[PDB]
Design a binder for this molecule. Structure first.
Ligand SMILES: Cc1nc[nH]c1CN1CCc2cccc(N)c2C1
Length: 150
């Protein structure tokens, strides 16, 4: 009973989280996951500031209101060569990654490791935070408040 949460650097408090390295997070799960990180779904303005500080991914993720990919460098296989906060317009499907916003993070680029999920609650799951440099932090608990997500 095990979940990997792969996390990125924070940029102006904004970071990307993916579950088990594959698109698998619902919109309700995304809100609960950010909450477990004492974070919220970013606004578009928070995301645009993060982009200006150096944030880009090649993954669709929830923010408040939309599914987006922040892009700095044009790449034909990421957001169809767009730059800026690319907004996903047309999709059949409902499960992506998520972005989260932590107001207490440093103002610019923070590529230190994440080593806690401070607001997860009691539960049976072995949750492992996986950083891009391979650093891991594990705890037993739960973050999903919606039965449909479990
Ligand atoms: C290349 C790729 N395919 C699906 N997701 C991804 C990006 N992942 C790749 C796996 C991974 C592991 C630990 C931290 C981070 N940020 C990531 C980012």
């Amino acid at each position: 009973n095990q979940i990997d949460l792969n996390v990125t650097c924070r940029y102006a408090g904004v970071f990307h989280v993916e579950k088990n390295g594959r698109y698998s997070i619902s919109r309700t799960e995304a809100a609960d996951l950010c909450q477990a990180f004492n974070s919220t779904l970013p606004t578009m303005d928070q995301m645009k500031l993060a982009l200006s500080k150096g944030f880009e991914t090649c993954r669709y993720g929830f923010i408040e209101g939309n599914v987006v990919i922040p892009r700095i460098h044009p790449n034909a296989i990421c957001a169809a060569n767009h730059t800026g906060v690319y907004i996903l317009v047309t999709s059949n499907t409902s499960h992506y990654d998520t972005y989260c916003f932590n107001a207490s993070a440093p103002p610019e680029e923070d590529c230190t490791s994440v080593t806690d999920l401070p607001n997860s609650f009691d539960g049976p799951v072995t949750i492992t935070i996986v950083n891009r440099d391979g650093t891991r932090y594990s705890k037993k608990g739960e973050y999903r408040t919606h039965q449909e997500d479990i």
